Amino acid sequence: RWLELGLTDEEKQNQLEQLAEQYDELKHEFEKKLEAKRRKITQGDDLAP
Amino acid sequence: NLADWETLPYDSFSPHQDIISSRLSTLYQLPTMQRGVLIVPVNTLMQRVCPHSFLHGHALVMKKGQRLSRDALRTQLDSAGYRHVDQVMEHGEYATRGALLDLFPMGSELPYRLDFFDDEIDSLRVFDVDSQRTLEEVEAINLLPAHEFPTDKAAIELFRSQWRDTFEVKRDPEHIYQQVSKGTLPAGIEYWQPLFFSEPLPPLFSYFPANTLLVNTGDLETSAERFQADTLARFENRGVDPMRPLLPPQSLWLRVDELFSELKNWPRVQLKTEHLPTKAANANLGFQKLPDLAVQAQQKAPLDALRKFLETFDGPVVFSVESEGRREALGELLARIKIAPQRIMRLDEASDRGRYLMIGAAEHGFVDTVRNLALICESDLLGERVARRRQDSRRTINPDTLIRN
């Protein structure tokens, strides 16, 4: 909670909203990328007959 | 009538805008008035509304031969927060069609056609939308803007100001702050309207000119206190939601004592069915409830009570009639009492022992002492002639048109 703090009405708190949004976006990036690499490692590997 | 929103205290939905627009007209036409009457209930009296100066700056007028660009006025309609609908049905909605810009305003009963020309207002032409065909020309329009409430960029910013003064904010996109920061409209926004104003919301009393009158019926303070308690109960019950945060009920509505302190400012006539003591400024004017004269069809005489009422009475008996299609039913019975009235529309034409009637849906008959006037209604006769209200004037369930539409 550095996000909800009482700030004067300006573009500053707008950018705090932006940065918290990007923080949540990186959280989502992590939670997809981790499972993505997990399936990438664990999956079968193509071969010759 | 100043109708209300007809929602829950701390509701979660949107009231029907049209009567709101109608109330807006009332808001448009309250500190301008010279006779006539508005009614309000106290729960409707507690909504403290945006200033008439705000309205007056926002509500504007176009004229018949006025030099105006189409997209210029359309930009003013964006300033009005008018809603772009391809097929417009209600207020604050607009459609683009050639030089024609169709819009249904939130003042009027009826929508408008503009057809501009060479930076110029050519036409101003109105129609029924379900007809979708021209009805008549007018040379002028006062267009009230699409909401009572500003939703412009400055409005959104200062909303965000007062919001982050008051409430908490989350990263959740379903936060009220979040959609208003996106500039879209919440369902239950209408309680959060104080967020637009540095000042507290002016009461309708603030709108009141000098020549207004206040008329009371009942200890309406008590009903107000009940509504305060009920709405306060909603202030705890709904005041647990992190997803819809609740303003102070003080910040929306006035309290009863301070209310009565502004009620000091205008003369007020109070009404009690109960008889008064003989203190000063007590009137107790000469009126009695007429005794019951219902139809007793099972015996020979449904009408003898009516009869012995009639010959002990000594004045005009006037009959409230719901419709002319009601009245022959009256005649159906009025031949049975040998006596039939003369239809009138003016009350004070009545004279001694005259039987008269008016088309009117009135509740109950009475006895007037001063002019000695009897009056007769349908609820006194055919039992409770009650009308079950399915919905309000504007909206209802649509079993016929909608599924066809």
Distance, CA of B392 to CA of B25 (rounded, Å): 18
Distance, CA of B327 to CA of B359 (rounded, Å): 8
Contacts of B236 (CB under 8 A, 6+ apart): none
Letter for the amino acid at B164? R
Letter for the amino acid at B97? R
Alpha carbon of B278 to those of B28, B193, B268, B269, B282: distances in Å?
A: 42, 47, 19, 16, 7
Size of interface A-B (CB pairs under 8 A): 21
Contact call for B171 and A4, based on CB within 8 A: no
Structure determined via = cryo-EM
Distance, CA of B345 to CA of B359 (rounded, Å): 8
Kind of pairing, strands B366-368 and B342-343? unpaired
- Here the tokens at position B292 are 């019951």
H helix runs in chain A, sequence order: 11-42
- Picking from B157, B171, B175 by the largest number of A CB atoms within 10 A of its own CB, the best residue to mutate is B171
Nearest-Cα distance to chain B for A35, in Å, is 24
Letter for the amino acid at B346? R
The answer to whether B242 and B170 have CB atoms below 8 angstroms apart is: yes
The answer to whether B106 and B144 have CB atoms below 8 angstroms apart is: yes
Distance, CA of B317 to CA of B307 (rounded, Å): 12
- The three-point CA angle B6-B12-B16 to 5° equals 40
Q: What is the resolution of this structure in A?
A: 4.1
The answer to whether B53 and B202 have CB atoms below 8 angstroms apart is: no
Distance, CA of B22 to CA of B172 (rounded, Å): 35
The answer to whether B164 and A6 have CB atoms below 8 angstroms apart is: yes
